[PDB]
Amino acid sequence: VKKLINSQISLLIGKGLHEFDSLRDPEVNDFRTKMRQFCEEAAAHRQQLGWVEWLQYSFPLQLEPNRALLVNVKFEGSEESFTFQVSTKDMPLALMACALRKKATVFRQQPEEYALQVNGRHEYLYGNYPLCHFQYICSCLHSGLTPHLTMVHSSSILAMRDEQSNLWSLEQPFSIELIEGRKVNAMKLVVQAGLFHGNEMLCKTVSSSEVNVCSEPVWKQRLEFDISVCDLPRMARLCFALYAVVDCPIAWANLMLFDYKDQLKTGERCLYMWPSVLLNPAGTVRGNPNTESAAALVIYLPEVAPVYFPALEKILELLREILERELYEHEKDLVWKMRHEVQEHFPEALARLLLVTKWNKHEDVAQMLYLLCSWPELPVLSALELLDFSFPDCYVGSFAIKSLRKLTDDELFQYLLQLVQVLKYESYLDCELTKFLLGRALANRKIGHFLFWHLRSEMHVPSVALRFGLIMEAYCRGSTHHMKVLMKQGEALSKLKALNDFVKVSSQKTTKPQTKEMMHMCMRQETYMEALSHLQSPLDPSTLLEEVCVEQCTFMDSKMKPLWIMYSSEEAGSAGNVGIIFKNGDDLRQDMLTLQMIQLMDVLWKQEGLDLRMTPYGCLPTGDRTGLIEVVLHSDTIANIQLNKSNMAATAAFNKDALLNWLKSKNPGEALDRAIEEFTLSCAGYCVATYVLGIGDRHSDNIMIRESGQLFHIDFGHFLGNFRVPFILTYDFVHVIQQGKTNNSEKFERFRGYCERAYTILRRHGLLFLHLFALMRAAGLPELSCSKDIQYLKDSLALGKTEEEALKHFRVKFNEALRESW
Numbered sequence: 001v002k003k004l005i006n007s008q009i010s011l012l013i014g015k016g017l018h019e020f021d022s023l024r025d026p027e028v029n030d031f032r033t034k035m036r037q038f039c040e041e042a043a044a045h046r047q048q049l050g051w052v053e054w055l056q057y058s059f060p061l062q063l064e065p066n067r068a069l070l071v072n073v074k075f076e077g078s079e080e081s082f083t084f085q086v087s088t089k090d091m092p093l094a095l096m097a098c099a100l101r102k103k104a105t106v107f108r109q110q111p112e113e114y115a116l117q118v119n120g121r122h123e124y125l126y127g128n129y130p131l132c133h134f135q136y137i138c139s140c141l142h143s144g145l146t147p148h149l150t151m152v153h154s155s156s157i158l159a160m161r162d163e164q165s166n167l168w169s170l171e172q173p174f175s176i177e178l179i180e181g182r183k184v185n186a187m188k189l190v191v192q193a194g195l196f197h198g199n200e201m202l203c204k205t206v207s208s209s210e211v212n213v214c215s216e217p218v219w220k221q222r223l224e225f226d227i228s229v230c231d232l233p234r235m236a237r238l239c240f241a242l243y244a245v246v247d248c249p250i251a252w253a254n255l256m257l258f259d260y261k262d263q264l265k266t267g268e269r270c271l272y273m274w275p276s277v278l279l280n281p282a283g284t285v286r287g288n289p290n291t292e293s294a295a296a297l298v299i300y301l302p303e304v305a306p307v308y309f310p311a312l313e314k315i316l317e318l319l320r321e322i323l324e325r326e327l328y329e330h331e332k333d334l335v336w337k338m339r340h341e342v343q344e345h346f347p348e349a350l351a352r353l354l355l356v357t358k359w360n361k362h363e364d365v366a367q368m369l370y371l372l373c374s375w376p377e378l379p380v381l382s383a384l385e386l387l388d389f390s391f392p393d394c395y396v397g398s399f400a401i402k403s404l405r406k407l408t409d410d411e412l413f414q415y416l417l418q419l420v421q422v423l424k425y426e427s428y429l430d431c432e433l434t435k436f437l438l439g440r441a442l443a444n445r446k447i448g449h450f451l452f453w454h455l456r457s458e459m460h461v462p463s464v465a466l467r468f469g470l471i472m473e474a475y476c477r478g479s480t481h482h483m484k485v486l487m488k489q490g491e492a493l494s495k496l497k498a499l500n501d502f503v504k505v506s507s508q509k510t511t512k513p514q515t516k517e518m519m520h521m522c523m524r525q526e527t528y529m530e531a532l533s534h535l536q537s538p539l540d541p542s543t544l545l546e547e548v549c550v551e552q553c554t555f556m557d558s559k560m561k562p563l564w565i566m567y568s569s570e571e572a573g574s575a576g577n578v579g580i581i582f583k584n585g586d587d588l589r590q591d592m593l594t595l596q597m598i599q600l601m602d603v604l605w606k607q608e609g610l611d612l613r614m615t616p617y618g619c620l621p622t623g624d625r626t627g628l629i630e631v632v633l634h635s636d637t638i639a640n641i642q643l644n645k646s647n648m649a650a651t652a653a654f655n656k657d658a659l660l661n662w663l664k665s666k667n668p669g670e671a672l673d674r675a676i677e678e679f680t681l682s683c684a685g686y687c688v689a690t691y692v693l694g695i696g697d698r699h700s701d702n703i704m705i706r707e708s709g710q711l712f713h714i715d716f717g718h719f720l721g722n723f724r725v726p727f728i729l730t731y732d733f734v735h736v737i738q739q740g741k742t743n744n745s746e747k748f749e750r751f752r753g754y755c756e757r758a759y760t761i762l763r764r765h766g767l768l769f770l771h772l773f774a775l776m777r778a779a780g781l782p783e784l785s786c787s788k789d790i791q792y793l794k795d796s797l798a799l800g801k802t803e804e805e806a807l808k809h810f811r812v813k814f815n816e817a818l819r820e821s822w
């Protein structure tokens with residue numbers, strides 16, 4: 001059985017576990033055994049949870065960041081139901097009390113013994129929360145749909161739980177010998193080497209002598225650094241670049257000077273080099289796995305004496321306010337001078353003090369660290385800044401994790417993408433962040449779900465495959481059941497890839513109806529019907545994908561030929577009707593980031609009572625240029641609508657009326673007012689989001705509208721002004737906001753108010769977007785490469801201004817945009 005699990009994991013993670021063994025690496029081995037131990041103890045804890053705690057683990061509450069309403073309620077084992085009237089103020093308990101008295105009366109004759117499932121979804125209502133605090137009940141209001149709920153007993157919940165069972169002495173200057181290498185080029189070769197602590201060099205870089213491109217190179221040269229060996233901090237990182245010169249970069253390679261066991265490295269090392277984009281401090285500290293083809297540099301670390309980094313107990317043994325809200329040297333001197341005053345009176349300015357300490361002097365690092373061990377815990381926002389590559393010391397990293405533990409699950413979920421990216425920064429396999437992520441994943445199935453997929457989606461990238469593979473393995477040890485749920489998802493995705501490939505080939509040799517009918521026959525094979533049906537959605541594990549509806553599946557006969565895959569569920573009713581888009585050929589990372597940031601804006605806006613009626617649909621990279629997009633049904637593109645086709649109800653005298661006619665046709669009579677407002681609200685949201693993010697190239701083809709009037713955006717390709725993008729007001733949208741009229745300053749200025757409110761709210765969390773984007777630099781995204789991209793966000797949110805000035809500025813941008821509209 002242990003054999004079966006091992007092969008299932010291998011298949012799941014896309015890496016054979018045998019590959020871990022073959023490395024004969026003590027660090028990997030230690031990583032695997034400790035992290036197995038921890039994950040198994042988590043599983044143990046879980047299988048004895050109380051039933052409400054179980055639900056909390058498996059179906060975490062979906063909450064929003066008097067009024068009468070109707071709700072249909074039924075019981076698990078019978079199709080008879082009752083439509084109640086309740087208040088949006090009532091708790092689930094009262095609703096459950098109603099349903100039980102109703103059951104008692106029909107059957108002719110304890111609320112606490114139950115939870116309420118949302119029909120056909122893995123979503124549950126429970127706890128002391130008025131129904132409208134639940135996303136599901138609150139959402140049902142706006143659509144006007146009747147909530148459909150199922151009473152589920154504690155014995156039924158516990159059956160689910162049950163079924164899911166499993167030193168200071170050395171003063172001589174640092175030096176290495178560069179022995180030789182084995183590369184390819186056109187000219188002389190040179191090797192540049194530097195020691196770094198984060199972004200900052202600990203001393204000047206040092207270089208080789210020029211040697212001809214012929215070789216198989218041989219250097220035999222000693223490179224000595226302007227830094228004392230006793231001054232090397234724990235996280236010292238030695239960085240190499242190899243290049244050609246008459247500047248023609250070839251390869252790079254980094255290593256920690258200390259290994260994972262606190263020992264200073266000696267003696268000889270062969271460095272399998274990564275092919276180039278000169279010095280790459282942020283690049284991984286492990287060698288290129290393609291040892292067959294990679295360039296390799298052999299160096300010698302000198303046996304300075306075993307010398308371990310000194311322990312904490314030995315470490316522990318050893319005018320201002322103005323600037324404190326980039327700094328000159330004297331200014332730096334004052335911050336350091338007043339470090340105690342920083343701890344006592346400005347604890348949230350920790351990062352700035354860290355950025356002034358001389359990490360290249362051990363006495364000073366000791367002074368800094370001594371204060372850090374007594375330092376008060378910081379707000380979440382501050383902890384996120386401290387995960388930046390600028391702060392590699394694992395005492396700081398420990399400190400940061402420590403302050404990060406107060407993240408709610410919802411917040412953790414919100415920042416998860418970024419935290420995963422920071423793993424790529426890690427100096428060693430076993431690290432606090434990994435342990436933290438795994439623990440939270442093991443405690444929350446939703447967290448566990450997305451952590452899995454964030455890692456899986458990168459297994460094709462050699463610099464991270466080892467790390468991410470080891471983490472996924474450990475997770476699987478902690479949940480055998482969830483592993484099988486995820487295999488089912490990976491099996492569906494393998495089949496979608498094969499189906500997409502077929503469609504791509506077929507569509508070149510034949511017409512769209514011809515390929516569609518062929519697609520359907522492919523899908524109706526037993527192997528496909530089975531693999532594609534009865535799974536949890538990768539986009540949202542609480543959405544169940546029941547029977548694939550073949551007749552409604554199709555593809556876009558253009559570009560990457562993405563697939564449109566529909567599902568239905570009797571048990572979920574109208575809510576069981578959901579679709580996914582499978583796409584293979586495009587990097588989906590940028591789309592996901594963009595959509596998560598828009599979703600963040602919506603959260604922050606809602607936290608201040610502003611609902612801009614946004615459409616935060618799922619987008620999830622799953623593999624090499626592969627992932628899923630959540631279908632928003634009942635929506636069309638502006639371009640399609642603007643095609644202004646005759647023989648329809650939207651057909652107009654003038655093209656500018658097309659969009660309003662379509663809205664009218666979807667929202668008869670009294671419904672029209674509301675659709676126009678939904679349009680106005682979402683328009684303001686998306687106009688502010690795309691402006692703040694620098695998302696240009698917006699046109700009728702990549703904007704959609706729902707039949708409610710909610711506007712939204714698709715196919716994000718370019719952000720942060722990678723084509724300074726102006727604020728955009730489109731005539732046709734302005735035309736709808738103004739209810740069809742040539743002038744309607746009342747409606748248009750209400751619309752301006754929305755934009756201004758949305759914009760000023762985002763400014764107040766300006767720092768949150770900055771720390772998040774900063775962490776994202778670890779992704780490798782080409783439009784998120786350097787300072788210039790971060791700076792885009794500063795200029796968009798006008799952070800260095802008072803709210804008064806920034807608003808003034810935003811207004812000219814807005815006014816300039818109304819001018820551009822005809």
Ligand SMILES: Cc1ccccc1-n1c(Cn2cnc3c(N)ncnc32)nc2cccc(C)c2c1=O
Pocket residue numbers: 554555556557562563564581582617629630631632633635636637640714715
């Ligand atoms: C639904 C639609 C209307 C007008 C123009 C394009 C599309 N559309 C779209 C537009 N679109 C992009 N993201 C969307 C999304 N998340 N929900 C609904 N439509 C979306 N996407 C497709 C993806 C795969 C396969 C197909 C056939 C489509 C597709 O037809």
